Design a protein around this ligand. Structure first.
Ligand SMILES: *[C@@H]1O[C@H](CO)[C@@H](O[C@@H]2O[C@H](CO)[C@@H](O)[C@H](O)[C@H]2NC(C)=O)[C@H](O)[C@H]1NC(C)=O
Ligand SMILES: *[C@@H]1O[C@H](CO)[C@@H](O[C@@H]2O[C@H](CO)[C@@H](O)[C@H](O)[C@H]2NC(C)=O)[C@H](O)[C@H]1NC(C)=O
Ligand code: 9SL
Ligand code: NAG
Ligand code: NAG
Ligand code: NAG
Ligand code: NAG
Ligand code: NAG
Ligand code: NAG
Ligand code: NAG
Lengths: 1140, 120, 173
């Protein structure tokens, strides 16, 4: 009877709803962070509902039969844990309430069980993770190898600091270190670069450096970043490398090591970033995406007065006028948005009013049509259509504005979408947004639930610590901008980590909360959180997606152009011509002799190219010559060079253009594109996709405009602040509250300045730039601080007054970056798919010769058995062969290599001699055993041993290993030069590589990387040329800019070596915001227009704001386009290898 | 807020040694110039406080006449420990013992209060 | 920014000449105060007699007749941290020939460190009656022409051989 009642209670429509409603309410309570005492009673009730809900299920299912029905399901295990925990706490409990309390967050997980269909989504997510097993192994191995290389090459390097040369009272470097521990005390002693947290990193070599005179370089003390950033230990090196792989603030690690290590080591980073980061991340996407398709597709496959009104009313319907009246309105809407686009911080009084008058007319017209619209079809008919309801809400808002949060008013701009119905692509963007809250609504909901659990979990665990510690983290003694103290704040940190910004925040948590706790939480958010985000992106994207002597002469010239020596000769000139470009720069004044030959050398080049062009005309004729795209490019370049030469000989030079014209030379490397077969193929693919890219860009521009317009209304003119010029610190606002007040201070004070941000929302054009930084996550935080801080147009900003304006940025990122990028990626890859289909289903990234080679590599995939080999007749020879052949013996060798690998890991900075000696000796035994194995295989195998490819790699490794040990030893006896020695040891890492032979899963992935090398090479060549043209433009244009942020000695545009280093850094668009900033400032007091620049003719160090913006922005976009290509090339090959 | 752990009531037999144990907990690492600890005694709840031991760079024992030479420091502050020892406790030692700890850079000042009762 | 460039070694007689001595600080950010001394010993004679001292903003010139008049500062101006010290002579004369040694004294202000440093740049110049074109300029111009002539000869050379062959082909058929 009771069981029937309970069972009756268990399955009911209301009960599932009741259990769920309480749970959502419970979540609001977790967010309290210091709930009042009275709330405690409420806490009891939640405990009561769960037991009751929990008790009935257990009572009915069990039948006092051990709760067999109840505990059989996995989810129920979770409920039992929660009930005991609430109950356990009342009972004697463990000491850490916060650690113990954190469990309560588990109730939130219950929500997953209650909501219908959520259980299915979570299961779907777990299935995807299983596919990722091989990639995980390779990633750990890859990160591990680089960590070993990084540790050997850079250990102890981050330690360098400039220690002053003269010390009073017979003090010693050693004596000084133990006695003092204070930033103020430390500053007197080591250099410290004007307010940086830590001492300047110095270098031994000529390339790195440098310390000011009177300061010498010695290595002592903690690594920069609280000691967190160091290459000293394997664990620390591993963290540093993991950061590089995910590219989080990777630029600083790169800048820091290069400075201490020297620029020559830039090579290490290029290989790691290029192979380790671009490639590894791509592999993860392919596997997740590939895995998603099987499950998505596999599941899908299984399924398959009164009379007057009528006269008047009939007339209104005729008035719908779809051919013209409906169409006419859209023109009106487009015009209206354009009207709204005009705004600025400084607006004249007459202009400000005109905008107001103009808005009313538009507001009236939209309403009249709506009121007018209603009469023609009747109200019920009128509200039937969804767009109508959508249009209606906007019109109503405007009417209320006149009499009855003015921001909502800024909101009428959405109206702009209406055009979506007409536009094919816009319709697609509308479709994508719908899918997230539509079919994929359950999946999107999970992301929301997970973000919520983490924000609360982080808050419970580290909330108290941030407040008490504050000081370890902040000099001031106040909370930092990013912290985990409150739910909104805790939430912001979690959201930041979804974008790859985890490292900066983590150092802060670690100082206050300790290393073990902070590391575990952040690592989980990053891995678990990102997997869900990745799934949503991929899931969303895929679902959405689905005499006449003259004639003889003419013939002959044709013969000359066609001939190989000539084609070959011309190419040499192009490389040579391009190379001469690199020499020019700030150091050209020195080495006057090279300058003279180069100037003369160009003239010979100009003559050769002009001469070559004439041959082209005779051989091809004008019609053939000008119908070619390449020739026009080629013809145009000779002309610019030709004009400068004629103008130059004549004199009458340096008067702007032609002088501006000289800078146009950087275009010379451009003719190289036509000559190389590999480079041309890649370019053809891009041209194929520009029209398609153009369509997406239009949608992005229209979409971004609404955000930009919205942004302008909210923050236009509010970013100004009064700052102390010496340290750039905003005044309190207790004093100097408004701009008017700030000026009075200047009149009686020397260094106070009232100044704008430089990248802001003052006008619509600027807003677009501000948005671009937020979209890329570079330089975004400086802007956000400004937005929240802001109060009014002529008033000094208070600290965190707005606080909720953060929401604006969060919404833009989700819509502006997550959705559009989803759209950008979807169209580009698809367009690439169509191109492949057109050219007979053949890869479009390789030259014809490359294709033959690609096929040969395909052959290596086959497993046909090779000959077994015959044991030699001799038993002595045979047993060894017999022993060697056995698989068990091979497993032993695999174990031995792993043992060897662990030995390398134990090495650490400042280990000591006894420790150092043992490692050296253990290493020797390893070399002997490995050499021993090689000899044994050889005795039994004989000629057969050389047949296998792997055996040869194994044999080669042994030769390198013995030589590496001996050479290091000879080097030690000979001495002189430590650096050659570290590189020499790098040979041991070779043995670790043999591990790949053992693992079948990792090898398949590795084979895929090898297959795509030909395609990647062509893109790499094209990418290199573009980087080269930009470096040249940069050297002439940006050398001499004042050094501010991101531009300092090294990592500057002063010379070609330097320019290349920067361009590589920005290829990933990291720190692009920093380099651009010095270029932006123009006029006093930002910079001095005329500066002496000893040793050179040029005057002033002012960036060209217009030229600078085009240059950085164009580069960011172009590099991104090519990188999309790497993503495309890797995916194609990966599907093929896995597919086999 | 500095974390302070002391027994609210400490009952000790006349003539025995009384360790007054208090725990102070705060983030950071203690600084000798920076760390300051003060101990005061009161005969009763409303009674004037008499400082009897301080830490300022080092331990300073004020040698109050009311304690003779029976007060000793009994704690390693670097351990968050600032306990004191009252040897050979006498009936007049009954009262309130206050520990005040101010630790730079921590702005907050910890306070522990022990009611010492002397048996018979 | 600052670059170090060596001064020209030949001065035409009866014409103005500029001597370049440029010294660059290791780090641009650091700020220090500089002063300079230039000492010149005429050719055929041992030793150096200081000719000028430049400290603060004013330039002090020695009273010796060889350089009396004829000298103007072309150094960094108003900086007080010169970096570039150069001397310009008007009406160059034979008497102005020999070895020039320029020493720099720099006060660098650090957080609690004050550093005094000395760097010596010596400039040697010989007066000549007529400007002599640099050898590099002459060799390159002559060298460039040969290339222009050789390439053209090569191009014309192929046509005579290639063209004749082409003409021959038409006749055979
Ligand atoms: C702007 O900030 C500067 C830099 O701290 C302030 O200058 C300090 O002023 C105090 C008293 O005037 C001096 O004792 C310090 O030595 C100064 N610092 C240095 C190193 O110069 C300055 O007070 C601020 N400006 C105003 C107008 O308050
Ligand atoms: C801008 O801020 C100033 C500073 O408070 C305001 O002007 C006055 O400030 C003085 C102090 O010198 C007070 O005695 C006055 O009471 C302030 N004004 C008034 C009317 O009380 C000023 O009002 C602020 N707003 C402006 C100038 O736009
Ligand atoms: N301030 C800002 O833009 O925050 C984002 C993040 N943080 C920094 N301190 N950076 C240094 C320069 C930079 O570009 O702003 C950045 N470098 C990377 N990789 N992301 C940026
Ligand atoms: C070295 O230190 C000693 C202190 O024992 C001092 O007497 C001596 O003068 C110092 N040496 C020099 C060269 O100052
Ligand atoms: C400084 O304020 C004084 C008032 O004593 C005024 O005379 C002077 O003009 C102000 N300075 C400037 C640059 O306006
Ligand atoms: C010394 O003790 C007194 C108690 O009377 C207290 O108010 C004061 O803060 C203490 N001194 C310091 C430096 O903490
Ligand atoms: C040039 O040198 C001679 C002798 O060395 C001297 O008599 C003469 O005065 C010098 N010329 C000038 C202009 O001082
Ligand atoms: C060097 O001095 C000459 C003398 O008139 C002066 O005209 C010239 O401008 C100076 N150099 C510079 C700074 O241009
Ligand atoms: C050079 O010196 C002579 C005196 O011998 C003087 O007449 C002439 O004006 C000077 N040259 C110039 C350019 O002033
Ligand atoms: C260093 O400065 C002092 C000032 O006390 C000065 O006398 C001395 O000449 C300077 N050193 C050098 C090498 O110029």
């Amino acid at each position: 009877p009771l069981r029937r009642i309970s069972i009756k209670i268990l399955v009911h429509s209301l009960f599932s709803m009741l259990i769920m409603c309480t749970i959502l309410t419970n979540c609001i309570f977790m967010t309290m962070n210091n709930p009042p005492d009275w709330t405690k009673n409420v806490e009891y009730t939640f405990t009561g509902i769960y037991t009751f809900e929990s008790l009935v299920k257990i009572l009915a299912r069990g039948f006092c039969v051990g709760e067999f029905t109840f505990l059989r399901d996995p989810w129920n295990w979770l409920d039992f844990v929660v009930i005991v925990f609430a109950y356990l706490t009342e009972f004697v409990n463990l000491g850490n309430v916060s650690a113990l309390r954190t469990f309560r967050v588990l109730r939130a997980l219950k929500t997953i069980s209650v909501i219908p269909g959520l259980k299915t989504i979570v299961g779907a997510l777990i299935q995807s993770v299983k596919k990722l097993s091989d990639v995980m192994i390779l990633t750990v191995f890859c990160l591990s190898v680089f960590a070993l290389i990084g540790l050997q090459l850079f250990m102890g390097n981050l330690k360098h600091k400039c220690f002053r040369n003269s010390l009073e009272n017979n003090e010693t470097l050693e004596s000084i270190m133990n006695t003092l521990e204070s930033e103020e005390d430390f500053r007197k002693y080591f250099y410290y670069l004007e307010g940086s947290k830590d001492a300047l990193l110095c270098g031994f070599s000529t390339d790195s450096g440098q310390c000011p005179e009177g300061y010498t370089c010695v290595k002592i003390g903690r690594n920069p970043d609280y000691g967190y950033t160091s290459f000293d230990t394997f664990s620390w090196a591993f963290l540093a490398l993991f950061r590089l792989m995910t590219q989080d603030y990777w630029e600083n690690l790169y800048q820091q090591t290069l400075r201490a290590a020297g620029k020559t080591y830039m090579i290490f980073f290029v290989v790691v970033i290029f192979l380790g980061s671009f490639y590894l991340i791509n592999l993860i996407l392919a596997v997740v995406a590939m895995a998603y398709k099987e499950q998505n597709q596999a599941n899908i496959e299984e399924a398959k007065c009164s009379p007057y009104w009528i006269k008047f009313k009939k007339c209104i319907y005729f008035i719908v006028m779809d051919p013209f009246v409906d169409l006419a309105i859209t023109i009106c809407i487009v015009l209206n948005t354009l009207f709204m686009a005009m705004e600025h911080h400084p607006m004249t009084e007459e202009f400000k009013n005109v905008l107001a008058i103009g808005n009313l007319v538009f507001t009236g017209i939209f309403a009249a049509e709506m009121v007018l619209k209603l009469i023609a079809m009747d109200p019920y008919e009128y509200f039937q259509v969804g767009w109508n309801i959508f249009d209606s809400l906007i019109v109503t808002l405007s009417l209320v504005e006149l009499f009855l949060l003015s921001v909502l008013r800024s909101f009428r701009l959405l109206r702009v979408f209406k055009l979506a119905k007409s536009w094919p692509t816009l319709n697609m963007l509308i479709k994508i947004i719908g899918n997230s809250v539509g079919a994929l609504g359950n999946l999107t909901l999970v992301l929301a639930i997970i973000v919520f659990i983490f924000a609360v979990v982080g808050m419970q665990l580290f909330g108290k610590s941030y407040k008490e510690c504050v000081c370890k983290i902040n000099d001031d003694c106040t909370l930092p901008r990013w912290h985990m103290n409150d739910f909104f704040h805790s939430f912001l940190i979690v959201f930041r980590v979804l974008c790859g910004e985890w490292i900066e925040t983590m150092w802060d948590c670690m100082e206050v909360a300790g290393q073990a706790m902070c590391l575990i939480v952040y690592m989980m958010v990053m891995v678990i959180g990102n997997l869900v985000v990745l799934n949503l992106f991929l899931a969303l994207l895929l679902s959405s997606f689905s005499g006449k002597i003259w004639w003889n002469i003419r013939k002959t010239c044709y013969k000359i152009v066609e001939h190989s020596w000539f084609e070959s000769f011309i190419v040499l000139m192009i490389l040579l011509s391009s190379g001469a470009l690199a020499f020019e720069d700030i150091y050209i004044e020195r080495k006057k002799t090279i300058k003279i030959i180069l100037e003369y050398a160009d003239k010979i080049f100009t003559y050769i190219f002009i001469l070559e062009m004439l041959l082209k005309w005779i051989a091809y004729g004008y019609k053939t010559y000008f119908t070619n795209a390449w020739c026009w490019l080629d013809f145009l370049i000779v002309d610019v060079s030709l004009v400068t030469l004629v103008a130059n000989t004549l004199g009458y030079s340096d008067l702007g253009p032609i002088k501006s014209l000289r800078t146009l030379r950087a275009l010379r490397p451009l003719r190289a594109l036509s000559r190389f077969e590999g480079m041309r193929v890649v370019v053809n693919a891009l041209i194929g996709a520009i029209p398609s890219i153009m369509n997406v860009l239009l949608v992005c521009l229209i979409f971004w405009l609404i955000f930009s317009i919205m942004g302008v209304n909210l923050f236009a003119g509010k970013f100004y602040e009064c700052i102390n010029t010496t340290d750039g610190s905003r005044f309190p606002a207790s004093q100097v509250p408004n701009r008017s007040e700030c000026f009075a201070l200047m009149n009686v004070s020397q260094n106070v300045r009232w100044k704008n941000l430089k990248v802001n929302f003052d006008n619509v054009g600027l807003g677009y730039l501000s948005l671009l930084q937020v979209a890329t996550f570079k330089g975004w935080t400086i802007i956000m601080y400004a937005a929240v801080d802001s109060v009014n147009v002529d008033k000094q900003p208070k600290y965190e007054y707005s606080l909720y304006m953060y929401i604006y940025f969060v919404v833009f990122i989700i819509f502006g970056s997550f959705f559009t990028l989803n759209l950008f990626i979807g169209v580009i890859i698809d367009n690439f798919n169509q191109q492949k289909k057109k050219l007979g289903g053949q890869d479009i990234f390789m030259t014809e010769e490359q294709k033959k080679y690609y096929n040969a590599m395909k052959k290596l995939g086959s497993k046909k058995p090779q000959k077994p080999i015959p044991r030699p007749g001799n038993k002595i020879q045979g047993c060894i062969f017999d022993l060697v052949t056995n698989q068990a013996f091979d497993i032993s060798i695999m174990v031995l290599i792993c043992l060897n690998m662990v030995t390398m890991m134990v090495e650490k900075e400042g280990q000591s001699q006894h420790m150092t000696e043992v490692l050296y000796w253990i290493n020797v035994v390893f070399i002997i055993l490995f050499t021993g194995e090689c000899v044994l295989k050889l005795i039994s195998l004989r000629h057969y041993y050389f047949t296998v490819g792997w055996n040869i790699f194994d044999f080669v490794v042994v030769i390198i290993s013995i030589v590496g040990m001996f050479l290091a030893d000879l080097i030690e006896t000979y001495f002189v030069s430590p650096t050659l020695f570290r590189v020499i040891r790098l040979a041991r890492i070779g043995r670790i590589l043999r591990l790949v032979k053992g693992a079948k899963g990792i090898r398949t992935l590795l084979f895929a990387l090898m297959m795509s090398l030909p395609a990647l090479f062509n893109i790499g060549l094209l990418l290199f040329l573009v980087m080269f043209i930009y470096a040249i433009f940069g050297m002439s244009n940006f050398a001499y800019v004042k050094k501010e942020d991101g531009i300092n000695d090294m990592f500057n545009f002063e010379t070609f070596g330097n320019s290349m280093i920067c361009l590589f850094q920005i290829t990933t668009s990291a720190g692009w915001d920093g380099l651009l900033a010095p270029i932006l400032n123009s006029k006093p007091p930002d910079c001095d227009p005329k500066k002496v620049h000893p040793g050179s003719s040029v005057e002033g160090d002012c960036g060209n704001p217009s030229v600078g913006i085009f240059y950085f922005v164009s580069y960011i976009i172009i590099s991104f386009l090519v990188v999309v290509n790497m993503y495309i090339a890797v995916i194609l090959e990966n599907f093929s290898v896995a597919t086999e | 807020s500095m974390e302070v752990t002391v027994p609210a009531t400490l009952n000790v037999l006349n003539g025995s040694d009384a360790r007054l144990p208090c725990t102070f907990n705060s983030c950071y690492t203690v600084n000798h110039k920076q760390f300051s600890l003060n101990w005061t005694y009161q005969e009763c709840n409303n009674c004037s406080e008499e400082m009897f031991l301080q830490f300022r760079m080092k331990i300073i024992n004020l040698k109050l006449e009311r304690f003779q030479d029976r007060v000793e420091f009994s704690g390693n502050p670097s351990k968050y420990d600032v306990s004191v020892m009252l040897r050979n406790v006498q009936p007049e030692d009954e009262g309130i013992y206050n520990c005040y700890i101010m630790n730079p850079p921590d702005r907050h000042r910890g306070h522990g209060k022990i009611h010492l009762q002397v048996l018979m | 920014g600052c670059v170090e460039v060596d001064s020209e070694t030949e001065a035409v007689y009866g014409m103005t000449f500029k001597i370049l001595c440029i010294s660059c600080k290791r780090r641009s950010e650091t700020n220090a105060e500089t002063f300079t001394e230039w000492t010149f010993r005429q050719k055929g004679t041992e030793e150096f007699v200081k000719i000028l001292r430049y400290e603060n903003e004013v330039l002090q010139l020695e009273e010796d007749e060889r350089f009396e008049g004829r000298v103007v500062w072309n150094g960094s101006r108003g900086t007080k941290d010169l970096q570039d010290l150069s001397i310009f002579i008007t009406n160059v004369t034979y008497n102005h020939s020999g070895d020039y040694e320029c020493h720099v004294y720099r006060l660098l202000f650090f957080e609690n460190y004050e550093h005094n440093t000395s760097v010596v740049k010596k400039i040697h110049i010989e007066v000549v009656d007529k400007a002599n074109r640099d050898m590099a300029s002459i060799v390159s111009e002559i060298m460039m022409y040969v290339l222009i002539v050789v390439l053209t000869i090569w191009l014309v050379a192929e046509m005579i051989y290639c063209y004749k062959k082409i003409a021959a082909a038409t006749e055979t058929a």
